[PDB]
Each structure stands twice: as C-alpha cells, then as structure tokens.
C-alpha cells in the first residue's frame, strides 16, 4: 500500500486513505497469522470449522425469515 500525497489533500484525509489501503491489502492480518507456526492439522481443522458454522448460520438465517417472532 503505497499512498502518494495528493494536492490540497489535508493530512487527516491522506491518513484515512492510507489506513484503509493497508486494511485492504490485509497486512496486519497476515502478520498476526505468521507470528507462530501452526501445524497443518490445526490449520485444516480451523478452516473446516469456520465453513461448517458459516454454512449453518446462513441456513439458520434463511429459515428465520420463514416464521414470525410475534
């Protein structure tokens, strides 16, 4: 994320652009993931668990529109 300062752009405005650019490239998430080694089994387990719960919540939501709560 290489942000060049634009003309007339105040520092706060440029800084917001730079922070969002980094958050878009996902630098901090990448660094946190590479702090410590995790076994391939741990990685696969975590990936599979997120998929299962994400799918379950989507299905739960898509059935919550069916019924009325009051």
């Amino acid at each position: 994320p290489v942000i060049k300062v634009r003309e007339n752009e105040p520092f706060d405005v440029a800084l917001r652009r730079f922070k969002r650019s980094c958050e878009k490239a996902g630098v901090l998430a990448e660094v946190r993931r590479r702090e410590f080694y995790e076994k391939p089994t741990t990685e696969r387990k975590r990936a599979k668990a997120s998929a299962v719960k994400r799918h379950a919540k989507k299905l739960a939501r898509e059935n919550a529109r069916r019924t009325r709560l009051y």
Binding site: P1, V2, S21, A25
Partner: protein
C-alpha cells in the same frame, strides 16, 4: 458479477496480454479472489497460471515494493 471470459469465448487466457491481467491483479500486485471478480473456477486457474508466468518474465511485478 458475470465472468468476462465465458462471455467472450476465450479458450486460453494468455500471459502475453498485459491488459486483461492488469485488471485481475490488485495494486499491491497480488491476484484478486474469484469470489470478488466473479470469474469461473476453470478460468481462475488459467488466469493464475498466466499471472505467474508473466511475473517470471517481468511483465508484471511480484509485489509493489521490490520496485
């Protein structure tokens, strides 16, 4: 999202076309997910291969910072 390779009949993506490939890399230089671009999985694999071949021949940069 609509795939721009299925609608054009493209068989092979080609690594020598540095206009289409520039649309499919980000500013940092990484390949954009197919979930974002709406490309199909078959063309995604071809596209990733083409981008990697272009990087070797220095038609595309590996990252935004080595230059």
């Amino acid at each position: 999202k609509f795939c721009r390779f299925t609608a054009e009949g493209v068989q092979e993506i080609d690594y020598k076309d540095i206009a289409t490939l520039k649309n499919y890399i980000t500013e940092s230089g990484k390949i954009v997910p197919s979930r974002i671009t709406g490309t199909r999985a078959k063309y995604q694999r071809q596209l990733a291969r083409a981008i990697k071949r272009a990087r070797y021949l220095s038609l595309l940069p590996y990252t935004d910072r080595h230059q």
